[PDB]
């Protein structure tokens, strides 16, 4: 049927032309909980509402601070590559973190000491490129689609540094003198960037490996997140990757969260930094508690970006009949949360009861072990 | 008698209605030293000039960047609790540092790993809560009055995150699902925050201690400052607590300084960061030397906040007949100063004489040992 | 007696060393009204808490954004001159408005067309100097003390442009070529600025007037504020000067308000801009209403600066037994206010009743005429 | 002859009065490479275009963010001292790094623990003073001329903290009480700063050394850069000093680069931070590649400051017949670059060929060893 | 000969490699007047130090806030066109003012009511294009070279809105629907912008004029500056154009100043706004007096930009043997200045004497008429 912004005796039918589809995707916004209050920034933006850059070989679209101004420290690109297609050799000012949602791809990277790392990634794997280090992505036989996250909200991926672009804007005399070749020998350099371009499939990983007088990199730039043992609680699963296990990932900590229907990521906050979210699949609502009696609830589904400013209280509730699967990203060297449940369980029961005006029947259910995802009884 | 802004042949009597009381509290402002020069920001604000928030169980008032704009990195709350009264369980974005001026109180804190620390503090003790970590304060039988310092000037304590406020702005369905209880069971949750509230006195410390599967915290969140051996020089005493002795205090370094009458905190500066001051008792003047021939003198007494921007030269002189007692606060992992006296004592005497146009009779009195507080002969 | 921050069952006695004199000056800050709520910036500062610059012939002290950061658009100097003493010929980037509180002075100004205006100002008169136009102030037989207001909060009086300072930092060859004289004829130029200097009394005003070829200025730069007919209401008087009557005063609108014991400047706000206040004599309290359930009360007396950000609700109550006299200053081309009383009086009484849940007995007292100052019955 | 802004069919003769000398110093600006494109900030400023402060004993002139706004993190002073002349004892907020271009000088420094270090420096030596630590420079028998670099673009050296200035603006009573002497004994203190002043030559280094109860400094504050073994490639030499070899230099990394005629600093970028440059001798051009098809070429010669924002591609080409010698400065704890040549040499040749549309004849010349300076064949 | 930074006993010879040619251009910077003091921003930049954009038909180079950061409100382009060459139809956010230094050009503009103005401008004429109004410039038989000034310092000429660029980035279906034509009829549209392009000479002005239904523009967009009567004084001429005579020039006031050898633009300041300068021919020095004892002298010659922040004192002295010709530009609706001479001449002579410690022999030379340019006697 047709939803209306009505809650008990409050609200009214909509009398003007409206976007009923979007209203149906945002039931907790058209009709917020009575417990919402006050001004809170927007914490939700869909990749479907962004310009998609189409190239021969795939596409790329972004959610940055220009779409979602609350997220000043983190931005993201949803990138797709056809089989064999190459995201051109390049670098940026920002560090890059990635999750492989679909397919597989080969990455390259050269570090500051001239050492190369080349590796394949599959679904559920991560990669991380430190700031300034040059890299590439090439999709294998199935193609690839993945999420890139960059540690500056102002990022733009029409504005990174491309190999062929650099050369196209360096005097020919200089390129020739740099390499010890003639101007003639470099006459066929492309006159513009490629960005994404089609290419034949690469050979075996084993045959791409390049040996150097500087040795192997000390830590890999890929990580098999789904092959780790998750934190398992009743209604779901949590896989964490930060700089304590994925060693190179110094500026980005991540978690992949799965929430079964009827379950929720429990009430908690982060005492370290802001949370940036991407919703891979499913449907959720989350209330952000902003202090001083301020709270706003948001709805999310596949393709949405979410956000929770530093230290604000939140939960993520599955409100659909399918699994809810989302990433949590933090610009920091480690993941950390404080669980509301565990916090109160570790305090004297009389003290908690004095706060909450509730009795022993509440404090008895408190648990001193942390269960990030909990399921309704 | 009635003081006038007159110094030698300079200045004149006041001919308009005036605040004679305040003028008497500020003799070095109504009549600055001839050596003051140029524009310098205000470095002085009284808690008596702030709004006091009164609650059942005590009060709290603050000096922030909105009162004292030079102090952008540090703000402070003067908080008072009646016996048994509780400063409600809460958290903030800022780290918190505290000094117990009067009475005693019990604190609680839970860290990111779910480990609890509960302890009593008495006069002269400190506590420190890292950013984001939740905590509480409850005054014991004498009540309590203490100074809180927060590591962001923009702090406001009507704007921290309260337990009952968070719950009051979370949908009931969500609270019930989070804990595995019915909406009925949480029906009596307060509909608003408490902030400070009255409560019966707590039992023994020994009986409040809560055991956990995550073990004890690695370092205590309280510190007995007055039980340490002070640096002792002729006219006073200095007790320092930074992250090298009070291990958890990573973002705040402190010193409690006592200056006998006729004595002064010697000429020095800090090569690391800004100094924030609180005057516990007594009366002082301080000249801040701001470079480029700029200097301004300020007066201080009990209840005043003071400040010295990064690297500016200063001293703190007791100008009353009682002990002068004040705190120095630094947003850094350690205390450090450069003493003017010791600096010059460690340089060739001819070199110093060449600078100062003074002879061997001056350089002979220079001391290579540091005496933070010196007494007039 | 000794005031305590106690109101019924709220609050507690002060247990730490305190500023009792300042507490007596701020009773509505030590014990605010219970209707106060939430974070509001400081709206109060005393000239007695500022460094007084003393010179041969008088003094100058200032309240600027460095003292009162809410006041970004307006700054003030309290300046005193002994008989005959001269505030040196100078100019600034800011426009300058002034109120003569004590004595009398001669002012000079030259405009952009090379025309001069020279006039005497006594108690209750104003002057106004448009931005960048050069001027001077010289006290007459009685000396002078006055309040200067500048239309930028970042103002400093140590940093305006002084005549002798300009000449001291111009090459002697250039000064010589500028006036067609030799270097020797200007060798006695002061090597530095004077700022304020002693001098004999000037002669009669009529013998100082300088005629020239560009004619008289079109509008005077002085105004006799107390010689106008004030708005008189039950408990006081209001004298207004803005660009509509004091024609040159384009960037500053002003009002002098007198409030008898037991009276108040009524509840109102300004739809145009911020209010800057100076308290000439008497004792006051004001609550600033900041919207969204935020309000904060402040106390003021002789020598205090006050402030009310744009559109915020306020009243100014006399809480002493002597008349309360203050200036209201606005950076705009006219004075404007909305009176709470007059506003409701101009609406249908039943509409007002539906809002306030009061009856005809309330709406019957509302007045359609504006009475800016009302007296307690 | 007379150069014109003409390149092939583009540009035109200059028809207005012009600066032919400067045009001759900037041939790649009057006539940029065709490969330049788009808006790029200015990356070049000459010390010859700055105000020189002359004192008895030498001079000092600066290039700061007020001259070169792209350089917000780094500023520089070119300072000259006559034999025996002393740069007065002082300190700043910024850390200081220096290179001795001509002559020799003695430095002093006292650290936070009261330990002194006194040492001589000669041509090609460096010194580094951590922020806030007080120091001095005195030229020996040949005099001295050197480059100072400060780690804040906003630096000004008329605004650092001078010993005699501090004392000149401290009340005499306070100075006397600080040292335990009479006001009489300090009567001859200078009434103003000296900054740079003449003085007789110092005695032996051995006789200036001052012994302390706090021991020797753990790491020296001077460094003999030219006595280290340089990285040697075909057309030049690179000497690097960062915090890994010059231990105290925590915030500044440096390299001195020598480029023979016909040679160039190869194409590279820095993945860590911005580059600041000083051209000691010779003549160069450099193209800064700013991403998104933006590139601008600049010319440089002795006395010029240059700059390369974080991660932008660049090279430095000798375009004269003398050696090109320049400093590269980075605000970071280590030097790091990525060499374009080595980057591509460490990747599969087919992959590189696919990017560049070039064959095996290009990829064969790629070198896996880094040669910072390369010479034309 | 070889200039050295030596003035009497102050300064020393330059011991490091140096830019002797630039030093010869800046003698009052290598050896400033002793009356100079303190930190002042750079007020000088050369067009010769900027990247010259070369196109078929001419060139464009710019001085913006990225070159001269003190100039935040005004930027400039030196543009050259060959005979018949066209600066492509375009518009910008900034208003545009121009002075024709060489040759002649045809300009077009269309206003907000759809009315067109087309006119020819020769040497010494101005044009002005209000913000956002579309225009073009086309050189006549001689070619043209001119100075453009834009009322925002952040301007870039690579980033204005070009006709063909707009069409190139609009969907072909939309362009077709916009004009009621087919996609094929617009297939020959340029695929990119032209910016500057060659073209045959236009015909007579009379045959270019386009009549339309909205009528003639009310005020012309060109002005014959050199055909007005200048202010003539002893050593030169001043021609002023602002909104009072050149009616459309609402945001830019201008003056062309000619100063004979041995003459100077007298000591004055502007009470309204900043001054931006361009030096057309000749050689000058100017001291900018910045208040508080700060002043700095700069040298200028043909091709230089200069600046004087709001209200700062200045003069412009011809220091060569040829006439000195420069533009003064102000972002305001009128030109205004206060003359130091005229100012003092309009005050009582004894008041002036008391300030300057000079006698009647000085005040007797003061002139009540403004002479903007004075000649050395
Ligand atoms: Co990338
Ligand atoms: Co979270
Ligand atoms: Co707290
Ligand atoms: Co200190
Ligand atoms: Co004035
Ligand atoms: Co008002
Ligand atoms: Co230094
Ligand atoms: Co480099
Ligand atoms: Co244009
Ligand atoms: Co001028």
Short mmCIF file of C-alpha atoms in Angstrom, two decimals, chain D residues 35-351:
data_model
loop_
_atom_site.label_atom_id
_atom_site.label_comp_id
_atom_site.label_asym_id
_atom_site.label_seq_id
_atom_site.Cartn_x
_atom_site.Cartn_y
_atom_site.Cartn_z
CA UNK D 35 53.40 19.59 -22.96
CA UNK D 36 52.64 22.12 -20.21
CA UNK D 37 48.92 22.44 -19.50
CA UNK D 38 46.44 24.01 -17.09
CA UNK D 39 46.58 26.08 -13.91
CA UNK D 40 49.43 25.26 -11.52
CA UNK D 41 50.58 27.39 -8.55
CA UNK D 42 53.87 29.33 -8.73
CA UNK D 43 56.76 27.07 -7.64
CA UNK D 44 59.63 29.59 -7.84
CA UNK D 45 60.82 32.70 -5.93
CA UNK D 46 64.23 34.49 -5.83
CA UNK D 47 65.92 35.70 -2.65
CA UNK D 48 66.95 38.66 -4.85
CA UNK D 49 63.28 39.68 -4.76
CA UNK D 50 63.22 39.95 -0.96
CA UNK D 51 63.94 42.71 1.53
CA UNK D 52 67.40 42.32 3.05
CA UNK D 53 67.75 43.21 6.74
CA UNK D 54 71.18 44.79 7.26
CA UNK D 55 72.80 44.85 10.70
CA UNK D 56 76.23 45.68 12.06
CA UNK D 57 77.80 42.26 11.44
CA UNK D 58 75.85 40.92 8.47
CA UNK D 59 72.40 40.43 7.01
CA UNK D 60 69.34 38.19 6.69
CA UNK D 61 66.56 37.86 4.14
CA UNK D 62 63.67 35.39 3.89
CA UNK D 63 61.38 33.51 1.57
CA UNK D 64 58.19 32.58 3.42
CA UNK D 65 54.56 31.75 2.65
CA UNK D 66 54.08 35.53 2.18
CA UNK D 67 56.38 35.32 -0.87
CA UNK D 68 55.65 31.77 -2.02
CA UNK D 69 52.15 30.75 -0.84
CA UNK D 70 52.37 27.13 -2.11
CA UNK D 71 55.00 26.48 0.61
CA UNK D 72 52.84 26.51 3.73
CA UNK D 73 54.99 24.11 5.79
CA UNK D 74 58.51 25.41 5.11
CA UNK D 75 60.20 28.84 5.06
CA UNK D 76 63.82 29.93 4.77
CA UNK D 77 66.33 32.57 5.74
CA UNK D 78 69.55 33.40 3.91
CA UNK D 79 71.83 34.70 6.68
CA UNK D 80 75.32 36.26 6.46
CA UNK D 81 77.76 36.94 9.32
CA UNK D 82 81.04 38.92 9.33
CA UNK D 83 84.01 37.42 11.25
CA UNK D 84 83.20 37.11 14.96
CA UNK D 85 79.68 38.47 14.47
CA UNK D 86 76.97 36.80 16.51
CA UNK D 87 73.40 35.87 15.67
CA UNK D 88 71.99 36.65 19.13
CA UNK D 89 70.93 33.86 21.53
CA UNK D 90 67.30 33.01 20.75
CA UNK D 91 64.61 30.41 20.18
CA UNK D 92 61.53 29.80 18.02
CA UNK D 93 58.39 27.74 17.77
CA UNK D 94 59.76 26.10 14.64
CA UNK D 95 62.52 23.54 14.31
CA UNK D 96 65.53 24.92 12.41
CA UNK D 97 67.71 23.17 9.81
CA UNK D 98 70.78 24.69 8.22
CA UNK D 99 73.38 24.21 5.47
CA UNK D 100 76.74 26.01 5.52
CA UNK D 101 77.34 27.36 2.02
CA UNK D 102 80.31 29.58 2.85
CA UNK D 103 82.82 29.91 5.68
CA UNK D 104 82.44 28.56 9.19
CA UNK D 105 80.66 29.26 12.45
CA UNK D 106 80.28 28.12 16.03
CA UNK D 107 76.84 27.12 17.30
CA UNK D 108 75.52 26.66 20.82
CA UNK D 109 72.39 24.88 22.00
CA UNK D 110 70.94 23.86 25.36
CA UNK D 111 68.35 21.04 25.44
CA UNK D 112 65.34 20.47 27.73
CA UNK D 113 67.49 18.69 30.34
CA UNK D 114 69.94 21.58 30.65
CA UNK D 115 72.73 19.88 28.67
CA UNK D 116 74.88 22.02 26.34
CA UNK D 117 76.34 21.27 22.92
CA UNK D 118 78.87 23.61 21.36
CA UNK D 119 80.52 22.86 18.04
CA UNK D 120 82.04 24.41 14.92
CA UNK D 121 80.59 23.90 11.43
CA UNK D 122 82.34 24.34 8.08
CA UNK D 123 81.25 24.41 4.42
CA UNK D 124 79.02 21.46 3.61
CA UNK D 125 78.12 20.83 7.24
CA UNK D 126 74.57 20.92 8.63
CA UNK D 127 73.03 21.81 11.96
CA UNK D 128 69.54 21.19 13.38
CA UNK D 129 67.84 22.79 16.39
CA UNK D 130 64.63 21.09 17.66
CA UNK D 131 61.66 23.41 18.16
CA UNK D 132 61.82 25.60 21.24
CA UNK D 133 65.49 24.90 22.05
CA UNK D 134 67.65 27.99 22.46
CA UNK D 135 70.67 28.57 20.28
CA UNK D 136 73.21 30.94 18.74
CA UNK D 137 75.53 31.22 15.74
CA UNK D 138 78.89 33.00 15.68
CA UNK D 139 81.00 33.25 12.53
CA UNK D 140 84.75 32.43 12.76
CA UNK D 141 87.69 34.11 10.93
CA UNK D 142 86.36 33.81 7.35
CA UNK D 143 82.86 34.89 8.32
CA UNK D 144 79.89 32.75 7.27
CA UNK D 145 76.92 32.52 4.93
CA UNK D 146 74.34 29.78 5.26
CA UNK D 147 70.77 28.70 4.53
CA UNK D 148 68.26 28.29 7.38
CA UNK D 149 65.08 26.31 6.85
CA UNK D 150 62.17 26.41 9.32
CA UNK D 151 59.33 23.91 9.54
CA UNK D 152 56.41 26.38 9.26
CA UNK D 153 55.74 28.54 6.18
CA UNK D 154 54.41 31.39 8.34
CA UNK D 155 57.78 31.91 10.02
CA UNK D 156 59.15 35.38 10.36
CA UNK D 157 62.63 36.15 11.71
CA UNK D 158 61.83 39.59 12.90
CA UNK D 159 59.45 37.59 15.20
CA UNK D 160 61.57 34.94 17.03
CA UNK D 161 62.33 35.09 20.77
CA UNK D 162 65.50 36.99 21.68
CA UNK D 163 67.34 36.80 25.00
CA UNK D 164 67.84 40.55 25.37
CA UNK D 165 64.30 41.29 24.10
CA UNK D 166 62.78 39.00 26.75
CA UNK D 167 64.80 40.71 29.45
CA UNK D 168 63.98 44.18 28.07
CA UNK D 169 60.30 43.31 28.54
CA UNK D 170 60.45 41.72 32.00
CA UNK D 171 60.02 43.95 35.08
CA UNK D 172 63.40 44.71 36.68
CA UNK D 173 62.11 43.53 40.06
CA UNK D 174 61.39 40.17 38.47
CA UNK D 175 64.80 39.82 36.76
CA UNK D 176 66.54 40.72 40.04
CA UNK D 177 64.45 38.25 42.05
CA UNK D 178 65.00 35.54 39.42
CA UNK D 179 68.79 35.65 39.70
CA UNK D 180 69.21 36.84 43.30
CA UNK D 181 70.84 40.14 42.41
CA UNK D 182 69.94 43.80 42.88
CA UNK D 183 68.15 46.01 40.36
CA UNK D 184 71.41 47.97 40.32
CA UNK D 185 73.40 44.98 39.09
CA UNK D 186 71.24 44.61 35.95
CA UNK D 187 71.01 48.37 35.26
CA UNK D 188 73.13 48.02 32.12
CA UNK D 189 70.92 45.40 30.34
CA UNK D 190 70.30 46.49 26.75
CA UNK D 191 66.97 48.31 26.31
CA UNK D 192 66.33 46.55 23.01
CA UNK D 193 67.30 43.46 20.99
CA UNK D 194 70.64 43.11 19.18
CA UNK D 195 69.65 40.40 16.59
CA UNK D 196 73.01 40.43 14.87
CA UNK D 197 75.95 42.26 16.45
CA UNK D 198 79.72 42.57 16.02
CA UNK D 199 82.05 40.77 18.42
CA UNK D 200 85.67 39.68 18.64
CA UNK D 201 86.58 36.23 17.35
CA UNK D 202 86.05 33.37 19.80
CA UNK D 203 88.89 31.35 21.29
CA UNK D 204 89.43 27.63 20.77
CA UNK D 205 86.40 25.32 20.63
CA UNK D 206 88.11 23.27 23.31
CA UNK D 207 87.95 26.24 25.77
CA UNK D 208 84.25 27.03 25.18
CA UNK D 209 83.01 23.57 26.19
CA UNK D 210 80.88 23.73 29.33
CA UNK D 211 80.67 20.82 31.76
CA UNK D 212 77.36 19.90 33.38
CA UNK D 213 75.87 17.71 36.15
CA UNK D 214 73.44 16.51 33.50
CA UNK D 215 76.06 15.03 31.19
CA UNK D 216 76.61 15.14 27.43
CA UNK D 217 73.80 15.34 24.85
CA UNK D 218 72.93 11.86 23.47
CA UNK D 219 73.22 12.93 19.80
CA UNK D 220 75.12 15.80 18.14
CA UNK D 221 73.29 18.77 16.62
CA UNK D 222 75.78 19.11 13.76
CA UNK D 223 76.42 16.77 10.83
CA UNK D 224 79.20 16.55 8.24
CA UNK D 225 77.14 15.93 5.10
CA UNK D 226 79.89 16.17 2.48
CA UNK D 227 82.07 13.68 4.38
CA UNK D 228 79.55 10.89 3.87
CA UNK D 229 79.69 8.63 0.85
CA UNK D 230 77.26 9.97 -1.77
CA UNK D 231 74.97 7.92 -3.97
CA UNK D 232 76.89 8.08 -7.23
CA UNK D 233 75.28 7.74 -10.62
CA UNK D 234 76.47 8.73 -14.09
CA UNK D 235 75.74 12.46 -14.25
CA UNK D 236 76.01 13.39 -10.56
CA UNK D 237 75.99 12.85 -6.79
CA UNK D 238 73.37 12.69 -4.01
CA UNK D 239 74.09 13.15 -0.27
CA UNK D 240 71.11 12.36 1.95
CA UNK D 241 70.67 13.38 5.60
CA UNK D 242 67.50 12.42 7.44
CA UNK D 243 66.62 11.16 10.93
CA UNK D 244 68.09 7.72 10.14
CA UNK D 245 71.67 9.11 9.88
CA UNK D 246 71.47 12.68 11.28
CA UNK D 247 69.68 11.42 14.42
CA UNK D 248 68.39 14.73 15.83
CA UNK D 249 66.84 15.85 12.52
CA UNK D 250 63.35 14.43 13.26
CA UNK D 251 61.17 16.88 11.30
CA UNK D 252 63.52 17.64 8.37
CA UNK D 253 64.99 15.30 5.74
CA UNK D 254 67.48 16.75 3.26
CA UNK D 255 69.47 15.93 0.18
CA UNK D 256 72.24 17.86 -1.56
CA UNK D 257 72.22 17.08 -5.28
CA UNK D 258 74.97 17.75 -7.82
CA UNK D 259 74.12 17.49 -11.51
CA UNK D 260 76.82 17.70 -14.16
CA UNK D 261 76.06 19.55 -17.45
CA UNK D 262 74.05 17.36 -19.83
CA UNK D 263 72.59 15.49 -16.85
CA UNK D 264 69.32 15.50 -14.85
CA UNK D 265 67.71 14.41 -11.60
CA UNK D 266 65.56 11.64 -13.07
CA UNK D 267 61.76 11.51 -13.25
CA UNK D 268 60.38 10.65 -9.83
CA UNK D 269 57.95 11.63 -7.10
CA UNK D 270 57.82 11.57 -3.33
CA UNK D 271 55.14 9.33 -1.77
CA UNK D 272 55.65 10.95 1.65
CA UNK D 273 55.46 14.77 1.50
CA UNK D 274 56.14 18.09 -0.23
CA UNK D 275 59.58 19.01 -1.57
CA UNK D 276 61.13 22.43 -0.90
CA UNK D 277 64.21 23.39 -2.96
CA UNK D 278 67.09 25.85 -2.79
CA UNK D 279 69.35 26.39 -5.79
CA UNK D 280 72.91 26.91 -4.59
CA UNK D 281 74.49 27.24 -8.03
CA UNK D 282 73.88 26.57 -11.71
CA UNK D 283 70.76 26.70 -13.88
CA UNK D 284 67.83 24.29 -14.14
CA UNK D 285 64.33 23.71 -15.40
CA UNK D 286 61.76 21.46 -13.76
CA UNK D 287 58.27 20.42 -14.84
CA UNK D 288 55.82 19.78 -12.03
CA UNK D 289 53.13 17.26 -13.07
CA UNK D 290 50.02 17.97 -11.01
CA UNK D 291 47.65 15.19 -12.23
CA UNK D 292 44.51 15.52 -14.38
CA UNK D 293 46.56 16.67 -17.37
CA UNK D 294 48.09 19.62 -15.45
CA UNK D 295 51.78 20.48 -15.79
CA UNK D 296 53.87 23.61 -15.54
CA UNK D 297 57.57 24.12 -16.15
CA UNK D 298 59.74 26.45 -14.07
CA UNK D 299 63.27 27.88 -14.41
CA UNK D 300 65.76 28.18 -11.57
CA UNK D 301 69.22 29.57 -10.92
CA UNK D 302 71.48 30.49 -8.00
CA UNK D 303 69.50 32.07 -5.18
CA UNK D 304 66.12 30.60 -6.19
CA UNK D 305 63.64 28.70 -4.03
CA UNK D 306 61.61 25.92 -5.67
CA UNK D 307 58.76 23.65 -4.56
CA UNK D 308 56.95 20.41 -5.48
CA UNK D 309 53.66 19.61 -3.75
CA UNK D 310 53.18 16.12 -2.22
CA UNK D 311 53.28 13.27 -4.79
CA UNK D 312 53.60 15.44 -7.92
CA UNK D 313 55.89 14.10 -10.63
CA UNK D 314 59.04 16.03 -11.35
CA UNK D 315 62.62 16.03 -12.65
CA UNK D 316 65.38 18.62 -12.39
CA UNK D 317 67.37 19.23 -15.58
CA UNK D 318 70.70 21.04 -15.86
CA UNK D 319 70.32 23.53 -18.70
CA UNK D 320 73.65 25.34 -18.27
CA UNK D 321 77.34 24.59 -18.80
CA UNK D 322 78.30 24.60 -15.09
CA UNK D 323 77.47 22.08 -12.34
CA UNK D 324 73.90 22.38 -10.98
CA UNK D 325 73.81 22.15 -7.22
CA UNK D 326 70.61 22.26 -5.15
CA UNK D 327 69.07 21.20 -1.83
CA UNK D 328 65.88 19.16 -1.47
CA UNK D 329 64.09 19.57 1.85
CA UNK D 330 61.24 17.49 3.27
CA UNK D 331 59.24 17.95 6.43
CA UNK D 332 59.39 14.26 7.47
CA UNK D 333 61.50 11.77 9.44
CA UNK D 334 62.98 10.20 6.29
CA UNK D 335 63.80 10.71 2.60
CA UNK D 336 61.87 8.61 0.11
CA UNK D 337 61.22 8.65 -3.61
CA UNK D 338 59.72 6.46 -6.31
CA UNK D 339 61.77 6.41 -9.46
CA UNK D 340 59.76 6.21 -12.69
CA UNK D 341 62.48 4.11 -14.34
CA UNK D 342 62.84 1.61 -11.49
CA UNK D 343 59.04 1.38 -11.04
CA UNK D 344 58.57 0.25 -14.63
CA UNK D 345 61.65 -2.00 -14.57
CA UNK D 346 60.10 -4.01 -11.73
CA UNK D 347 56.88 -4.77 -13.65
CA UNK D 348 56.29 -7.42 -16.38
CA UNK D 349 57.46 -6.03 -19.73
CA UNK D 350 54.25 -6.99 -21.56
CA UNK D 351 52.21 -5.05 -18.97
#
